[PDB]
Amino acid sequence: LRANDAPIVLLHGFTGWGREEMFGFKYWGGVRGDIEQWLNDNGYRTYTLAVGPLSSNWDRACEAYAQLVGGTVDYGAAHAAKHGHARFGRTYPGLLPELKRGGRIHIIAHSQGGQTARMLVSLLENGSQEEREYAKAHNVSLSPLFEGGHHFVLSVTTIATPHDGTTLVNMVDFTDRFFDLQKAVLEAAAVASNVPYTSQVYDFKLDQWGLRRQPGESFDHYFERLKRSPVWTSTDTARYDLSVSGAEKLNQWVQASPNTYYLSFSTERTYRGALTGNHYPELGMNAFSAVVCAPFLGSYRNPTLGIDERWLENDGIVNTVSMNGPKRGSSDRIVPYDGTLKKGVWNDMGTYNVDHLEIIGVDPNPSFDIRAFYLRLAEQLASLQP
Ligand SMILES: [Ca+2]
Ligand SMILES: [Cl-]
Ligand code: NA
Ligand SMILES: [Zn+2]
């Protein structure tokens, strides 16, 4: 039974783009359809966010905040100074200015979207003491985001999120394989990587870094520059936050708010081998993961640095163990779902036999009823007591 009227907001991972980008092929639904549209049509009011795919969680959290309330992205004077990029990004009209007046949202996030969402809550609740002190000391203005004592997220749901990172980052030639993954996603959207499109197609939103695909430049050639740029080589990146190491550092300061419900969905798409119990990709796993990513994830161990057999089950991109909520460096509490959702803790909603891209429809999986999945989820979120 419906207990709240908060709209849902969709948030992508280290790939992702707006409803007008990719010629309208949806990150949220890919080849199966349009998930925002299903939810709207069933009376669950839903919006989509689009933030820097490769950018740091912090950056994406600041971009999400401006996209929601309205205004110019403000990364924080201290952060901008420390990392070497613009303080101010683009300007948004604001999807939900009512959040300034007591409105709230449910955030549904995929992949690294799940770190960004947790970071947005943490920033709203506590702000950033570093940003507050720096503003005072240098006599510059301060984004309300960094003050603290704000609240507008009623729930965060995460789907296949690397809360404790993914070992994929430790692969040899991770750099080249990761950009090949970006190319494989362009291909699923029927977009070539060797064509210098004059339309934008896929905006990496790297205003703060001063980076933009050039006239006459293809995605192949762009990515070769990106690989060599600060959005790939600095610690202020999705790359850094995605590693077991960065993820743990994030968990050190991004904690669960007592005022927000947390829901986690875990994914797996592998089988256990008969030799040493390595994991291998199942049939139907998206081809790029099955060939390039899954063998690595299902066999890479580091008994010193925590990584043992529990890490081998994966969804083709993320270790399944990483997904039920943050554990390394975290004091958040994770409880199995028991039929009542509780505020302030991770309600682990179970593991689904779906891969990283299938769960958002970017790869087909006809045995997966993705429409029922996301409708069932909208209905549980609509039942949450405010
Ligand atoms: Ca498939
Ligand atoms: Cl450039
Ligand atoms: Na992604
Ligand atoms: Zn930054």
Numbering used by the authors: 3 to 388
Task: Give passages from the manuscript.
Most lipases contain a lid domain controlling access to the active site. The interaction of the enzyme with the lipid aggregates induces the displacement of the lid, which makes the active site accessible to individual substrate molecules and increases the catalytic activity. Here, we report on the effect of an ion pair network on the stability of T1 lipase by introducing an additional ion pair at the inter-loop and the intra-loop. In addition, we elucidated the structure of D311E lipase to identify the additional interactions that govern the stability of this mutant.
The X-ray structure of D311E lipase (2.1 Å) showed a typical α/β hydrolase canonical fold consisting of 11 β-strands and 13 α-helices. The Ser113, Asp317 and His358 were assigned as the catalytic triad. Compared to BTL2 lipase, this crystal lipase was solved in closed conformation at high resolution (2.1 Å) using in-house X-ray diffractometer. In D311E lipase, the ion pair network was composed of five amino acid residues (Arg 274, Thr 278, Gly 279, Arg 303 and Glu 311) connected by seven ion pairs. In D311E lipase, the distances from these ion pairs were between 2.5 Å and 5.2 Å. In contrast, the distances of ion pair involved in T1 lipase were longer than those in D311E lipase. The Glu 311 and Gly 279 were connected by one hydrogen bond and linked to each other at an α-helix and a band region. T1 lipase (circle), K344R lipase (triangle) and D311E lipase (square) showed different Tm, which were 68.52 °C, 68.54 °C and 70.59 °C, respectively. The t1/2 of D311E lipase at 60 °C and 70 °C was 110 min and up to 12 h, respectively. The improved stability of D311E lipase was due to additional inter-loop interactions, which were indicated by the atomic details of D311E lipase with the observed additional ion pair and hydrogen bond interactions.
